[PDB]
Design a binder for these strands. Structure first.
Ligand code: DLU
Ligand code: CL
Ligand code: MG
Ligand code: MG
Ligand code: ZN
Ligand code: ZN
Ligand code: ZN
Lengths: 252, 270, 69, 47, 48
DNA sequence: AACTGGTAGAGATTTTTCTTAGC
DNA sequence: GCTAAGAAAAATCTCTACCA
DNA sequence: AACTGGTAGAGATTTTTCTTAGC
DNA sequence: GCTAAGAAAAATCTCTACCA
């Protein structure tokens, strides 16, 4: 265990690994490897979307693309005013976690209805991939046009073919597997951060071997069944539980 | 004896329709004969059997229903294993808008099984053509039995309570419907893992994909064939793949069926 | 000739005592109780009954299955 | 049901004087009514 | 076989062995909520 | 400050009773 | 003569629909 | 022959945690 | 210094209305 912590610290000193790889290799828990990463001085987006509009056969299409995976949601608007763009933004924010929106300096994107929707849904709007996605979507639309009667059915069938039937990239996945994996990784990071702060609200007085004095207040990191990992003086050490006293610390 | 009691009890039930305890007490016949006298009557036998079933909860099953609110028509679709809600306001209750809503939902999320009631819009050629083109298995419930689609009617109740909570913050009803969908999906926690509905659908689909890839990489390099002895008769069956060897029992795969065999009735051959 | 008739009657008695059931079900909009039918398939939750050369699916909560002694 | 079985078992014991286990296996009536059919005959004794 | 096919085959076999021994515990680190017969509550987190 | 859900039947499971083989 | 296995029969417990 | 009730909140009761008096 | 009483706070179990 302590040999695992020493090997992990030497391995991060050489190669600067990440905490998932160290937790899998050296068989240490995740909070300890995250603290090893958090102590390195040389080591210190999944919710950004881009929106645009286009024209196709006299219809006004609006396209929203998740940037980090290439995930497309499209719709056919009856006009190009601000209320319909605000309604499309409200549906998009109600289905996926949207935290940062990037648009161009158009008329309908600079409107009081879109600003009210961004205020109620807590989205940061920023004015300046989407043109390449519009080009690829129009190629698919002209490829499967003869199987539909209206234009909305062709738009939604092209969205389905782009999202789940086209595979590429490094691992050979589509866009839906990429966006689900990215958001799941971010969720794991936030849950681990909550556990880290809740554990680190404590304090430990420990007694060394062949001594009867209590030592300085070291910060608790991991409280096991028989072992306790503490940080003191930029050093991690493992003390057994029968030589330690854990108190609360109100030191904000 | 009680044979004349049996004849008099049959005539008494023919006139008065007693239950079995009255005949067994008044005519001193045993209870099996009185239960048979009651059980061979057609004017009786009006009662169920007092049990409930359990609906399908596969990771790609969706359920759909329609509801009314303030003179509008809402259409609700729910992902069953997580509780994830998509809802829209329709201008009419025909089959074309239902096929369009189903096509948008199938273009966003992976759908492989759809469950509905027997309404006039769900049983239509447009919905059948969309299900054929998108390869969806469409199943219908037993008619006039709303308990088969329990999840979507429960979510109808939850959606209506949220809409009454946030009604004064919106002008139209479509804005209030979309705000209620956002409040349900991301602002309410509690359930299986303490998650909301969006975190739970992300966790379910990502875990399914990761466990399929992991067991493909495991099972492509396996060995250790196992011959087992089971059944009512002590026979011997063909070659099966060993999966997991544990203290007490072994897990085998035979004919794409998983079985758990005790360690005494199996033999491992490399 | 006689012994094979004994074996045939024993096997026919076992096959006849396998699945001689009657079902009183409740279906429709006005949920009234209807006459006897023949049970075909019995799964956990619903049953399939043959009535008047019509196949119907009734849940087990809306039907009563009478066996034989 | 087995009520017609009880009637036919009474006729069969009136003719041939069977025992109770034979009538219970042949006519598919329970054992209590078969023992009562044997008991109400003055010449037979259930054993 | 040439030399390149032999070195690729040898390294792939050894890596398959070691990563199999790790991936068994990786697939046993999941949690399952299941349902039994005639009870309407979801049972606790058994191991897959 | 002084009011309120209940009844009966269908199966499943546990207990009691009755006949008979074996030492 | 006495005892235990085994099966039939009676007793108890849990759960559902309907009452404007 | 291949179908099926469920979701979320209010209290009551049991378990865990945190501070302090007493030997 | 160590231990037990006591009270606050978090976790679990049972039960109800509503969904055309
Ligand atoms: C014309 C379509 C097809 C034929 O049936 C009708 C009537 N119906 C009735 C209810 C209903 O009574 N819901 C309340 C409810 C009551 C008890 C329960 F357990 C669950 C519940 F939801 C529906 O929900 C519903 O969707 C329909 C419906 O769609 N139709
Ligand atoms: Cl229906
Ligand atoms: Mg409906
Ligand atoms: Mg409904
Ligand atoms: Zn570093
Ligand atoms: Zn009657
Ligand atoms: Zn006689």
């Amino acid at each position: 265990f302590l040999d695992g912590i020493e090997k992990a610290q030497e391995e991060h000193e050489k190669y600067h690994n990440n905490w998932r790889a160290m937790a899998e290799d050296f068989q240490i828990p995740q909070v300890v490897a995250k603290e090893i990463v958090a102590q390195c001085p040389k080591c210190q987006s999944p919710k950004t979307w881009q929106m645009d509009c286009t024209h196709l056969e006299g219809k006004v299409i609006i396209v929203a693309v998740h940037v980090a995976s290439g995930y497309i949601e499209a719709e056919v608007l009856p006009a190009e005013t601000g209320k319909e763009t605000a309604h499309f933004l409200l549906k998009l924010a109600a289905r996926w976690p949207v935290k940062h929106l990037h648009t161009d300096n158009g008329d309908n994107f600079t409107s009081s209805a879109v600003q009210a929707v961004c205020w109620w849904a807590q989205i940061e709007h920023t004015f300046g991939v989407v043109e390449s996605m519009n080009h690829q979507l129009k190629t698919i639309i002209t490829q499967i046009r003869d199987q539909a009667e209206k234009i909305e059915t062709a738009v939604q069938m092209a969205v389905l073919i782009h999202n789940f039937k086209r595979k590429g990239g490094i691992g050979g996945y589509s866009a839906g597997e990429r966006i689900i994996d990215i958001i799941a990784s971010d969720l794991q990071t936030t849950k681990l951060q909550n556990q880290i702060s809740k554990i680190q609200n404590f304090r430990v007085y420990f007694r060394e071997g062949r001594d009867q004095q209590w030592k300085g207040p070291a910060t608790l990191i991991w409280k096991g069944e028989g072992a306790v990992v503490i940080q003191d003086g930029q050093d991690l050490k493992v003390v057994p539980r029968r030589k330690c006293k854990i108190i609360k610390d109100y030191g904000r």
